[PDB]
Design a protein around this ligand. Structure first.
Ligand code: F3S
Ligand code: F3S
Lengths: 281, 282
């Protein structure tokens, strides 16, 4: 009956959790120095935590033969991964399985004879990686970041459409419907990942079943704010905090249940410091 | 007189023009009585013209062995076409080539393992015929007429989407985008016919380039009424008419260029009646 519960999918998404796990496990039996190919995520504290364990964020090309290099969740072009192996590095591929699914999808579409449209941000490392995969399987295509970008694809009778894993649904729906009006045949493989949905649906499920909701994340964190607001409309008894320091004793008078979730940038140890600060109250 | 320009694409689309011509030509090979399966178009004067030639709009199942029946541009289920053949009728298939392409597309999508969504009007004869093809090729699918209809397609991982030839693009765009957000793999074969778009854009270009615009068609013709509004927006001197009788001499005072178009249900002989009455006014 009685419960103080952490919402499933709280904090880091699947891919990042897995990348962190892979990094940590690489330290066991590492004969050389262990590097991530740049910082493993944009969270300085977590990058710092990993550095303290011996997982170093690479600056350039400083790793040498026998060192371990971990490919980030966004992946890299296949020829770059190959170049790293050729240097004698032990390569740990932490590319997100959802990202790998995009790699596979652009190759599938090429085999099926489609000109490929990748809906996403041109300069993004994930997109650059996927273009490398498209190239390697002898595919052709373009990145569509705004509606103006679709012109080249409209020259083709058969267009295959995929998404950057973090592509906004609204623009994706718009691109797909617009291209469909102009060309003979369109095939869409929806490669948008389910991370944000998973986190948010889980909060919607928990919030009406607890007395108070703690939503952890940066004050100015956009996605934590969304989580807060989703929780808020179901449970007016909802607090958005950054660290266990804010958990005020008075908030838990007469509560039998406490729900916790956290924004995409919050590591599990911060979620844990909050849990233990509450179990005290 | 003055300069009269009939807008490009005024009147019957390719498929209806073709159906009319096939109907007329069948008289030269028909030993029995010639029928269209229902009135060939929704225009009483055109149906009457064809009736006077010996092409009769069927009312029920009155045709007999040896008679000719003409399938309309919208097509029919394949088992009904076969039923007609089995009754010993000479069956002329005047289904539009573009409607036949929808029939082809639902079967192709079925072979490729898709659950089919047909975006269109459930009770429309074109849609009924296409469902008959989908059924014939052991396919499965639904008609999506409003957005609430998509529910059943969302149960499937692979959805193929086609359109009734006359489906509006705005709804088709919405359905395609929406289904794509919910299912793993979507294939769209865009079977929307451009005949309505061409007709409208030709009016768009002609409207400001003439003194008066004449739009011909039945009042109950929805797409004739759209031709009127589109024109009336770009040139105040747009008048919608059903007959040359309605042409007021008043409208053609001090005019140099006259534009004429017509809705999808207007035969060329009506457009000529209007043109030469305008020439009689000037
Ligand atoms: S890293 Fe993440 S946000 Fe999605 S593509 Fe992978 S679960
Ligand atoms: S009857 Fe017509 S409007 Fe298009 S689908 Fe065929 S030309």
């Amino acid at each position: 009956m009685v419960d103080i519960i952490i919402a499933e999918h709280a904090g880091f998404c699947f891919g990042v959790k897995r990348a962190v796990k892979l990094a940590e496990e690489s330290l066991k039996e590492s004969q050389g120095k262990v590097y991530t190919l740049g910082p493993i995520i944009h969270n300085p504290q977590e990058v710092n935590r990993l550095k303290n364990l011996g997982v170093f964020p690479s600056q350039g090309e400083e790793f040498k033969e026998g060192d371990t290099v971990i490919i980030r969740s966004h992946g890299i072009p296949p020829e770059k991964e190959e170049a790293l192996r050729k240097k004698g590095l032990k390569v740990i591929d932490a590319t997100c399985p959802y990202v790998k699914a995009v790699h596979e999808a652009v190759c599938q579409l090429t085999r099926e004879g489609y000109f490929v449209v990748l809906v996403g941000e041109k300069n993004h490392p994930e997109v650059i990686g996927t273009l490398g995969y498209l190239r390697a399987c002898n595919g052709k295509g373009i990145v569509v970041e705004t509606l103006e970008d679709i012109g080249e694809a409209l020259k083709h009778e058969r267009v295959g459409i995929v998404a950057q894993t973090t592509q906004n649904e609204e623009f994706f729906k718009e691109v797909v419907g617009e291209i469909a009006l102009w060309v003979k045949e369109v095939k869409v493989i929806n490669t948008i990942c389910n991370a944000t949905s998973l986190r948010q649906e889980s909060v919607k499920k928990l919030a009406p079943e607890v007395d108070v909701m703690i939503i952890i994340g940066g004050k100015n964190s956009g996605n934590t704010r969304r989580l807060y607001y989703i929780s808020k409309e179901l449970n007016p008894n909802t607090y958005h905090i950054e660290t266990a320091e804010e958990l005020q004793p008075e908030w838990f008078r007469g509560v039998k249940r406490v729900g916790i979730s956290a924004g995409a940038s919050t590591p599990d140890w911060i979620i844990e410091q909050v849990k233990s600060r509450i179990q005290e109250i």
